[PDB]
């Protein structure tokens, strides 16, 4: 198999003379063929904070990674990397990565404090913001890298194991793993024989794996976005025996719902980052699935648990309107996942922005509130059994009270007594 130089949200040249090197919530880096050299342009989305600049690439940089403090550039063939801090405080610096016969740099990543270079032989070379080398590690061949602060999310591919991922921390001394080469259940692309004349074949030759982008969320959870246009989030990565990849957004379904239930073929999503519950992205309108020039303004797509059926959504309509009873199930599930994720974050890393405890509080509130609607629907159909199981999943004790009051209005006194037993059982376990 042929390893190709990868960068988050990078686009191919295709039939034009310009492509995007990388692209995320901070901005976008473009490169233009300039006779025999290249014109690289680093642009930002917050025009107030950063000033767009550009420079002449005499090396042919095909690897890039953008963070909030600097831009990292990489040359897959010569092994040359360059880190350009945005601010004039620290100088730019350049290194040449040792490459063996046919060894290529396949992915680069940089945070304000760490610089990571991965090769096609599986060499994991890390540095600090000034270029001081860390220990060199040999792993599985690396196909994609993203990072955030001191943590690295790496994707590996052998012909033996297939697609794996690793989640590590680059401490002051050495590298420590949270997860090492666990299976990465991302759906690979399914290329046909008619795709040999398809307009989008150029992409899957430039990125065979179909990893459109990968990134840490704003709260530090790993995310990947494959060719199936589904956002996968890694939950419970701190507990190896409990780590699960959770599909939290079917962007094909959101587009289908934006278009009022009508199937489209010219609208596609290009992922930038995940902010709590919202996917920052670029809405690409056109024949190709990747953004072109000029770049549209970033859109926002709220994550939605893939529990909606197209058939059942059309009937309830007869922009898509969602029945309150059906939207309560998705809102319950999504709140459950988000609350479970944020609680793990706060219990291990604390706050990072200053308002997380309020977010979790309102999140758990929405959890119970959505759960109580499901409870009401179960009481409506006299389904005492289903209702009781729903009440058991309630969090706040004041929501147990709201269930008692809902059960009273439904004239189910047996249920009321059973719900008050939950309150007693929780009072008993709070003392034992």
């Amino acid at each position: 198999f042929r390893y190709m130089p990868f960068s988050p949200a990078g686009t191919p040249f295709g039939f034009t003379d310009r492509r995007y090197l990388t692209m995320n919530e901070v901005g976008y880096v473009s490169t233009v063929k300039n006779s025999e050299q290249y014109s690289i342009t680093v642009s930002f989305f917050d025009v107030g904070r950063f000033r767009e600049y550009h420079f002449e690439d005499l090396f042919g940089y095909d690897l890039c990674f953008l963070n909030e403090k600097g831009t990292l550039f990489g040359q897959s063939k010569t092994g040359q990397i360059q880190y350009r801090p945005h601010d004039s405080i620290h100088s730019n610096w350049t290194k040449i990565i040792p490459l063996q016969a046919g060894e290529r740099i396949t992915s680069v990543a940089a945070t304000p404090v760490r610089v990571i270079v991965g090769t096609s032989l599986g060499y994991f070379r890390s540095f600090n913001q000034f270029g001081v080398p860390f220990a060199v590690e040999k792993t599985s061949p690396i196909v994609a890298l993203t990072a955030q602060n001191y943590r690295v999310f790496s994707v590996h591919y052998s012909q033996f194991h297939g697609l794996s991922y690793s989640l590590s921390e680059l401490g002051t001394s050495s590298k420590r793993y949270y997860k090492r080469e666990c299976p990465l259940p991302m759906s690979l692309p399914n290329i046909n024989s008619d795709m040999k004349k398809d307009a989008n074949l150029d992409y899957y030759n430039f990125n065979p794996m179909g990893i459109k982008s990968l990134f840490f969320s704003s709260y530090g959870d790993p995310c990947i976005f494959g060719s199936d246009n589904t956002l996968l989030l890694l939950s419970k990565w701190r507990s190896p025996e409990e780590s699960k990849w959770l599909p939290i957004l079917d962007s094909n379904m959101e587009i289908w719902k934006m278009s009022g239930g009508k199937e489209t073929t010219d609208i596609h999503v290009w992922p930038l980052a995940l902010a709590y519950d919202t996917l920052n992205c670029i809405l690409v309108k056109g024949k190709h699935i990747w953004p072109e020039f000029p770049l549209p303004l970033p859109s926002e797509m709220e994550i939605r648990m893939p529990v909606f059926v197209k058939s059942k959504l059309l009937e309830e309509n007869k922009e898509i309107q969602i029945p309150v009873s059906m939207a309560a199930e998705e809102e319950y599930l999504r709140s459950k996942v988000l609350s479970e994720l944020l609680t793990d974050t706060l219990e291990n890393d604390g706050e990072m922005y200053g308002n997380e405890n309020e977010v979790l509080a309102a999140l758990n509130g929405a959890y119970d509130k959505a759960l109580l609607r499901l409870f009401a629907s179960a009481c409506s159909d006299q389904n005492v059994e289903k209702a009781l199981s729903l009440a058991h999943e309630l969090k706040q004790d004041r929501a147990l009270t709201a269930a008692v009051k809902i059960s009273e209005r439904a004239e189910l006194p047996s249920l009321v007594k059973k719900i008050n037993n939950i309150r007693e059982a929780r009072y008993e376990q709070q003392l034992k």
């Binding site: 119970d368 509130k369 706040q396 929501a399 009270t401 709201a402 009051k405 809902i406 209005r409 439904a410």
Partner: peptide, 14 residues
């Protein structure tokens, strides 16, 4: 009666 439970949901706040 069960369709509008906003009167019950807002009592949780306190």
């Amino acid at each position: 009666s069960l369709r509008n439970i906003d009167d019950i949901l807002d009592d949780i706040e306190g």
